């Protein structure tokens, strides 16, 4: 009678996972209309970043042999024309490698057996030339998308299992999944942007969090738990760089639990060993990417390890505030000494973009790159409308009630000042999840687009409202508890259906005719070895289709590209035209492709348009005739007489412009 429970839990978890996958797939097909799109048109649907990553999957699946393709993409000389780079450890293209390795032999076998996996026919767009669209599991785009969606459809199962664990009742899991479904649009954007990296690294992060909660709750240990943690930590680091920081939150939330006598010694040792092993495997797999070191995930691991390995030496301390304060001081000291003792100590790379989107929000630090980051509206403060939509589904108030209940219970049932080393506190996983929720919320509020972490944790913590121990224990009988939890679920369904209705009703647009003509022109009227340079979103697609070498791309994290962008974007500045021509010639670029909408005054949000960003960043040159006026004049007049070194080659319907540098 207690075994049929586990079967139902597992079955419901799998069913909710499958339903989530179906939902994401349906939303994707509704938004983009991949069903009846030209094959060369889906790639154009893959915008600024999506195009870059998918280009390497397309390159690998096309090469004579998988080994030859991997060797090509590990020595890429076209992503950043001028020098050879290794794209596997720079862009984290392991998902593409795995997908191509699976696809190539699958398609070879399908051809061998004559199995009909790709069946397609012509699509008559209309006035434009008819195009051919192919659909099925064999079509490369469907294979990639199905892989992405299968990998990302287990987030529902992970959330359901987390709700079942921290609430020890199927009602907790139901509350978690229901809260996730109604707040789906604000939880993930995998149905609108598959090819990104987060779509691959979030499911594994959530799985690892669930596994860690399970380990903490039952106080497991041994080689089994270490292997289980590594199997989900390695993939989440090989798929996306930001995982290195996400894991840094866990060590910040695990530590707080460890210092509160809520985690045994053996389980803490197992967790830390699994983290160390996963980091070592990840570092060895990425050709020793230097940026892995000097991050906040390595020093944190070492500090937590030393704290764990010296805790028994302090078993005699009985004053909790002193213990906690000393542990926090040692943790912070080690973390900052390691991070500061290597980055500035040895000058080993290090990326300041994370630290520059924060000083620019508090101080007056303007800069140029931070200006690009802060004006995107997905690196800015989370807007009020998102909170309005979340509190509409009551996802927030339930989280607040559950958190207040848990804090009340912890205060009542714990002696805060004085500590006993031998006895464990009990309910460690709940505190761990609560601390991660606060960390994630503090992240999300500063920067939008990190609601990806804040919303699933809200769904999880909303399940504490169904715990028997947290909510009076046996003081409320059993008939009442079921009735109280059915009423809550009935209330939610009253405020959740409209959200699903709106999400399904939404329809996307797929016209984008200008870029198709521009790419036709590029394919027809230029050589195969020309070098292109221009605005970062256009160059990504220029590389993805037409296979022309590019000078700057949309991947902006690493150094060596920030200075390339600072030079390429000089065309919109007020510098003398001769100097910009010299810069372009030195870089070796042949064509500069941009849009006439980039050089239009805003007068509504200054310091977010290119004309303005080059005023502060280029103040000594202030007062000179801005180039944008020169480009507009040359485009409209059609005779580029005043701009001698340059010469407009392509100008169609005054939307896209291609200049040729002699």
């Amino acid at each position, epitope marked *: 009678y207690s075994q049929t429970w586990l079967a139902s839990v597992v079955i419901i978890g799998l069913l909710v996972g499958y339903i989530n996958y179906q939902h994401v797939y349906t939303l994707f097909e509704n938004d983009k209309h991949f069903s009846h799109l030209a094959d060369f048109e889906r790639e154009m649907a893959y915008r600024t970043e999506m195009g870059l990553y998918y280009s390497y999957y397309k390159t690998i699946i096309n090469a004579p042999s998988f080994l030859e393709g991997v060797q090509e993409i590990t020595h890429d000389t076209v992503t950043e024309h001028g020098h050879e780079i290794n794209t596997l450890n720079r862009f984290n293209l392991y998902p593409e490698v795995i997908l191509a390795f699976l696809y190539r032999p699958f398609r070879a076998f399908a051809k061998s057996a004559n199995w009909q996996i790709e069946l397609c026919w012509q699509v008559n767009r209309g006035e434009l030339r008819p195009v051919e669209s192919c659909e099925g599991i064999g079509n490369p785009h469907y294979f990639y998308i199905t892989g992405v969606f299968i990998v990302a459809g287990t987030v529902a199962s992970s959330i359901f299992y987390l709700g079942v664990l921290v609430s020890d009742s199927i009602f907790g899991g139901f509350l978690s999944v229901l809260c996730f479904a109604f707040n789906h649009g604000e939880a993930t954007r995998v149905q609108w942007t598959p090819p990104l990296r987060e779509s691959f690294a979030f499911p594994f992060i959530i799985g690892h969090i669930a596994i860690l909660t399970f380990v903490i709750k039952y106080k497991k240990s041994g080689h089994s738990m270490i292997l289980l943690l590594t199997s989900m930590a390695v993939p989440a680091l090989l798929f996306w760089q930001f995982t290195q920081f996400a894991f840094f939150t866990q060590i910040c939330s695990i530590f707080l639990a460890f210092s509160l006598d809520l985690i045994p010694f053996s389980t803490a040792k197992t967790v830390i060993h699994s983290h160390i092993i996963s980091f070592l495997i990840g570092f060895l797999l990425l050709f020793g990417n230097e940026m892995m070191i000097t991050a906040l995930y390595f020093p944190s691991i070492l500090a937590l390890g030393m704290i764990i390995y010296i805790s028994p030496l302090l*078993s*005699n*301390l*009985k*004053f909790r505030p*002193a213990y906690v304060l000393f542990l926090a001081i040692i943790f912070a000291s080690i973390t900052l000494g390691l991070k500061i003792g290597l980055s500035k100590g040895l000058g080993i790379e290090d990326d300041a973009h994370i630290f520059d989107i924060l000083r620019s929000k508090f101080t007056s630090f303007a800069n140029f790159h931070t200006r690009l980051y802060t004006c995107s509206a997905e690196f800015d403060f989370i807007q009020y409308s998102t909170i309005e939509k979340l509190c509409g589904t009551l996802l927030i108030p339930l989280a607040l009630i559950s958190l207040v209940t848990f804090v009340f219970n912890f205060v009542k049932n714990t*002696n805060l*000042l*004085w500590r*006993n*080393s*031998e*006895e464990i506190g009990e309910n460690g996983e709940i505190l761990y999840n609560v601390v991660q929720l606060c960390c994630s919320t503090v992240m999300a509020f500063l920067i939008m687009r990190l609601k990806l972490f804040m919303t699933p944790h809200l769904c999880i913590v909303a399940a504490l409202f169904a715990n028997s121990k947290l909510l009076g224990g046996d003081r409320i009988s059993k008939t009442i508890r079921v009735s109280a939890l059915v009423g809550v679920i009935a209330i939610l369904f009253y405020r959740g259906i409209p959200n699903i209705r709106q999400q399904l009703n939404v329809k996307g647009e797929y016209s984008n005719p200008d870029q198709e003509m521009l790419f036709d022109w590029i394919q027809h009227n230029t050589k195969q070895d020309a070098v292109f340079a221009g605005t970062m979103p256009v160059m990504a697609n220029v590389k993805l289709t037409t296979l022309r070498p590019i000078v700057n791309h949309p991947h902006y994290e690493h150094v060596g590209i920030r200075e390339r962008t600072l030079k390429v974007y000089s065309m919109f500045s007020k510098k003398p035209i001769a100097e910009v021509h010299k810069i372009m010639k030195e870089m070796g670029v042949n064509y500069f492709v941009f849009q006439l909408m980039n050089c239009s005054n805003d007068e509504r949000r200054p310091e977010c348009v290119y004309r303005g960003m080059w005023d502060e960043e280029d103040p000594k040159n202030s007062g000179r005739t801005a180039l944008c006026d020169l480009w507009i004049l040359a485009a409209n007049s059609k005779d580029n007489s005043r701009i001698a070194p340059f010469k407009i080659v392509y100008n169609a319907n005054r939307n896209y412009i291609v200049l040729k540098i002699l």
Partner: antibody
Framework: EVQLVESGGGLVQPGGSLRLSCAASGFNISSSSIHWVRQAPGKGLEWVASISSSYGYTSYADSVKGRFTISADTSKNTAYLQMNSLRAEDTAVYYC??????????????????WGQGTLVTVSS | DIQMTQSPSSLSASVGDRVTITCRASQSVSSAVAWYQQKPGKAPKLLIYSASSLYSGVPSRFSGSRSGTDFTLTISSLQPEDFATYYCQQGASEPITFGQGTKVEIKR
């Protein structure tokens, strides 16, 4: 030269209020915690209240958590216990014992090295 | 809410006989225990602090010992002066709980 002296004990009707003092001569208060300990007639010692006057920390025994208040007057180096709503079982001898300050507790309270003479308080009708 | 219990609620010994008093803590106070001596009509005084150290001034005959959660006070040879109650105190928690107390008398 270090010595605790308790004063203010006597007789009181049930439900009344008493206000007794522990004066320390020698060592200065606020450098170490002082505890008020109870002994009923023919029984063992019982812990009543504790005050660490360095930064103003106070703790009370669960049995009298809500009827007793200990206040430290660092100007004259003395402490006071105010007891109100006396029951019929609170008649006893009260001692004032010194120990390490709570903030420097650090592996637990130190032993009550120096004790006072002790004052008897009785509730009768 | 941590209880310290003394096993020999009453013990009788004559002059010069070795004596042993036991104390048991329900929880696991590490070494925050102490032993006080109270004679009738006066206030208690410290005899052992930390369950192993002898307070400065008291005769060296008294000794303290710890083993597991058990604590013991050992007197090598009782003398007419040390005939009074002995209390076991714990100071590793906010509620400082004393022991019941054992009284040593003269056998006859």
């Amino acid at each position: 030269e270090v010595q605790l002296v308790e004063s203010g004990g006597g007789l009181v009707q049930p439900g009344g209020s008493l206000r007794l003092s522990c004066a320390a001569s020698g060592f200065n208060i606020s450098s170490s915690s002082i505890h008020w300990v109870r002994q009923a007639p023919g029984k063992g010692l019982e812990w009543v209240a504790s005050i660490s006057s360095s930064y103003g920390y106070t703790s009370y025994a669960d049995s009298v958590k809500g009827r007793f208040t200990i206040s430290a007057d660092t100007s004259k180096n003395t402490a006071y216990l105010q007891m109100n709503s006396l029951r019929a079982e609170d008649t006893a001898v009260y001692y004032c014992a010194r120990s390490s300050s709570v903030y420097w507790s650090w592996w637990g309270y130190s032993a009550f090295d120096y004790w006072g003479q002790g004052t008897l308080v009785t509730v009768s009708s | 809410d941590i209880q310290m219990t003394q096993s020999p609620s009453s013990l009788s010994a004559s002059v010069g006989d070795r004596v042993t008093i036991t104390c048991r803590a329900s929880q696991s106070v590490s070494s925050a225990v102490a032993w006080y001596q109270q004679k009738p009509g006066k206030a208690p005084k410290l005899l052992i602090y930390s369950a192993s150290s002898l307070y400065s001034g008291v005769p060296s005959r008294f000794s303290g010992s710890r083993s597991g959660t058990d604590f013991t006070l050992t007197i090598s040879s009782l003398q007419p002066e040390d005939f009074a109650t002995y209390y076991c105190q714990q100071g590793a928690s906010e509620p400082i709980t004393f022991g019941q107390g054992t009284k040593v008398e003269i056998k006859r």
